[PDB]
Design a protein around this nucleic acid. Structure first.
Length: 65
DNA sequence: GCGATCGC
DNA sequence: GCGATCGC
């Protein structure tokens, strides 16, 4: 699933298969992802988040140490 | 300031 | 250990 978001006001897209960590941050769903060997950070407003990312968020929470 | 991650 | 990164 492709996640579309804005990074410094510019459109960006990341596949869920590259996403690492996902968490709720206020009104946003924050995430980190693998950007060809480097950590990338992105955020999408929760109301705009696709289902696949919201499902990953749920899983992340249930299993957080 | 909000939550967490994660660079250094 | 501490502080920048992400949007606002």
């Amino acid at each position: 699933v492709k996640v579309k978001f804005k990074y410094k006001g510019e459109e960006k897209e990341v596949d869920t298969s590259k996403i690492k960590k996902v968490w709720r941050f206020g009104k946003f769903v924050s995430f980190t992802y693998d950007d060809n060997g480097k950590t990338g950070r992105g955020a999408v407003s929760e109301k705009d988040a696709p289902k696949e990312l919201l499902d990953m968020l749920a899983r992340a929470e249930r299993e957080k140490k």
